[PDB]
């Protein structure tokens, strides 16, 4: 479907249990390298395969274009299509990832769309998913159930009435990190063209899920996704799935902390 870059992976041969799709700008190489050394490292988690890919569009900068071309050649984990990669095109970026799952990895049991300024505890996520007994039409994350369109003209999430004309948004999950069973990717790509467009990608996916009659559900009896960020501790971070507001160096320091304290017990 018009992909400029496709990861060197074969999901039919080796169906992944969890596929991470990470959004990042071309200049955010430091982010991607920190993820590649930390929670993005492909591995078997409780015998389940984890795969990690980075979603990119295109840019006017020839330098960044060449950098990203070289990165794809060294890492082979970039999914790319020809759309201008800017904040207000994040919906295209998300739909590219969903399209990739639909076309090339329908075998994925679960797919997590995540941001680059994030800590992800794949071990705990896998444990909770294996416990949920939900393999189809499943969608979870930080649930946002009574959200009102931001009508402040200079806010990053401002939508005019012509862009979104209704008083409330549909149920949706924060775009920081959301997880869905792999079949969900095909149903969304299908109805995508008939659902009203909105430039906020997490609201757009919510509109698609609503059209599909897919209901959001909490992953666990306790909160596990933290779009607002968290005060760090080893024992807390062992029992969460996702935390936002995390810069590259902090992610390496947190990952080192968890490695250093492996084998220590927590209340």
Ligand X SMILES: OC[C@H]1O[C@@H](O)[C@H](O)[C@@H](O)[C@H]1O
Ligand Y SMILES: *[C@@H]1O[C@H](CO)[C@@H](O[C@@H]2O[C@H](CO)[C@@H](O)[C@H](O)[C@H]2NC(C)=O)[C@H](O)[C@H]1NC(C)=O
Ligand Z SMILES: O=c1ccn([C@@H]2O[C@H](COP(=O)(O)OP(=O)(O)O)[C@@H](O)[C@H]2O)c(=O)[nH]1
Ligand U SMILES: *[C@@H]1O[C@H](CO[C@@H]2O[C@@H](C)[C@@H](O)[C@@H](O)[C@@H]2O)[C@@H](O)[C@H](O)[C@H]1NC(C)=O
Ligand V SMILES: CC(=O)N[C@H]1[C@H](O[C@H]2[C@@H](O)[C@@H](CO)O[C@H](O[C@@H]3[C@H](O)[C@@H](O)[C@H](O[C@H]4[C@H](O)[C@@H](O)[C@H](O)O[C@@H]4CO)O[C@@H]3CO)[C@@H]2O)O[C@H](CO)[C@H](O)[C@@H]1O
Q: Which residue shows structure tokens 């049991």?
A: 109
Asked whether position 77 contacts Mn ion by CB under 5 A, the answer is: no
Q: Minimum distance between the CB of residue 58 and ligand Z, rounded to whole angstroms? A: 11
> What is the rounded CA–CA span in Å between residue 14 and residue 8?
12
Q: Minimum distance between the CB of residue 115 and Mn ion, rounded to whole angstroms? A: 4
Q: Which of 238, 49, 180, 202 is nearest to 115 (CA)?
A: 202
Size of interface with ligand V, in residues (CB under 6 A): 12
Q: Which residue shows structure tokens 């330098």?
A: 63
Residue numbers of the site for ligand X (CB under 6 A)? 90, 115, 174-176, 200-202
Q: Where are the beta strands (DSSP E) in the chain?
A: 3-5, 18-23, 43-45, 48-58, 78-84, 110-114, 118-120, 139-144, 172-181, 225-226, 242-244
Binding-site partner at residue 90 among ligand Y, Mn ion, ligand X, none, CB < 5 to 8 Å by type: ligand X
Residue numbers of the site for ligand U (CB under 6 A)? 131-133
Tell me, residue by residue from 83 to 122, as one string, x for binding to Mn ion by CB under 5 A and - for no binding. --------------------------------x-x-----
Residue numbers of the site for ligand Y (CB under 6 A)? 83-84, 86, 88-89
Binding-site partner at residue 186 among Mn ion, ligand Z, ligand Y, none, CB < 5 to 8 Å by type: none
Q: Minimum distance between the CB of residue 34 and ligand X, rounded to whole angstroms? A: 18
Q: Give the nearer residue to ligand Z in terms of CB position, either 24 or 187.
A: 24
Residue in 147, 212, 229, 258 binding ligand V, rule: CB under 6 A: 147
Angle at which helices 248-260 and 29-37 cross, to 10°: 10
23: its two tokens: 């959004």
Asked whether position 175 contacts ligand V by CB under 6 A, the answer is: yes
Residue 58: Cβ-neighbour burial (10 angstroms; 0-12, 13-18, 19+): middle
Q: Give the nearer residue to ligand Y in terms of CB position, either 78 or 240.
A: 78
DSSP-derived 3-state class of residue 88: helix
Could you tell me where the DSSP H helices lie in 40-84? Answer: 62-75
Kindly list the residues in this chain that would bind ligand V in the complex (CB under 6 A): 147, 150, 155-157, 174-176, 200, 202-203, 227
């Amino acid at each position: 479907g018009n992909f400029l870059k496709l990861p060197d992976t074969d999901c039919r041969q080796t169906p992944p249990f969890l596929v991470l799709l990470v959004t990042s700008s071309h200049k955010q190489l430091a982010e991607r390298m920190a993820i590649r050394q930390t929670w993005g490292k492909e591995r078997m988690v409780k015998g389940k395969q984890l795969k990690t890919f980075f979603l990119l569009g295109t840019t006017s900068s020839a330098a960044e274009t060449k950098e990203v071309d070289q990165e794809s050649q060294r890492h082979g984990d970039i999914i790319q299509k020809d759309f201008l990669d800017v904040y207000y095109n994040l919906t295209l970026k998300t739909m590219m990832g969903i399209e990739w799952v639909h076309r090339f990895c329908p075998q994925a049991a679960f797919v997590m769309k995540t941001d680059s300024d994030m800590f992800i505890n794949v071990d705990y996520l896998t444990e909770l998913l294996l416990k949920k007994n939900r393999t189809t039409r499943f969608f979870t994350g930080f649930l946002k159930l009574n959200e009102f369109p931001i009508r402040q003209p200079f806010s990053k999430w401002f939508v005019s009435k012509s862009e979104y004309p209704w008083d409330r948004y549909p149920p949706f999950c924060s775009g920081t990190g959301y997880v869905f069973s792999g079949d969900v990717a095909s149903q969304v790509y299908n109805v995508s063209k008939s659902v009203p467009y909105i430039k906020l990608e997490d609201v757009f996916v919510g509109l698609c899920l609503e059209r599909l009659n897919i209901r959001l559900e909490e992953l666990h009896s306790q909160p596990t996704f933290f779009p607002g960020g968290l005060r760090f501790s080893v024992c807390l971070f062992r029992r969460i799935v996702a935390c936002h507001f995390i810069k590259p160096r902090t992610l390496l320091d947190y990952w080192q902390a968890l490695e250093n304290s492996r084998g220590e017990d927590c209340p």
